[PDB]
Amino acid sequence: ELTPDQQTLLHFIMDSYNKQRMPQEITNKILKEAFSAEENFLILTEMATNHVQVLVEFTKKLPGFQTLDHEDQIALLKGSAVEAMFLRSAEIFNKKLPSGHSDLLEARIRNSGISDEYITPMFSFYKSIGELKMTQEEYALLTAIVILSPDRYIKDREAVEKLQEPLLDVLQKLCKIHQPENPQHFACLLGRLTELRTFNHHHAEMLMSWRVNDHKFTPLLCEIWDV
């Protein structure tokens, strides 16, 4: 039971979310590249760089984002980059792959210059995400909400927390239609947003590690991740 201004909004969010492709040239490296900390770090860079290019495209095709302040427009984007990437990584990671393709993935994630003290909470988050059995619509909406977060140095807030509002209201209605058995679903979804936010500290810690140990990032990533 969605309203018409809700189905249109949803259809909009879904239209931009389904544009997010990942060139076969980059992904094919997972199945063809050599197993070494460098080649795996190389994959992460190319992927996370394409992700930012596509996330900006998803962000501006958002309803009302373009009707915002050029410093609030870029405030939000700069701020959601890390969260949105790990959320996308959790979504992909949680897809049913064929025989030992998930083991291959997990092996690469490990040998990519990240110390396990972060890897452990990473997989901890992925399983928790996997447990919620999230639909396509919930990932897209969750992504829109993580971007439209009037929190952490945009000046306005009220306007930011006006576009995000019907989004959450749509995310709620969705939780009842598809998971009416579990009425804690909505609370649990927002719950993963909290665990998601904690990734900025861990990400900063891993950044310096690759940094001090001679691992280079693309100029776009240097702007987004602050290097």
Binding site: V56, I74, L77, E223
Partner: peptide, 10 residues
């Protein structure tokens, strides 16, 4: 900076 504003505008 340069790249982000660029991607946003064009």
């Amino acid at each position: 900076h340069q790249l982000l504003r660029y991607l946003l505008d064009k």
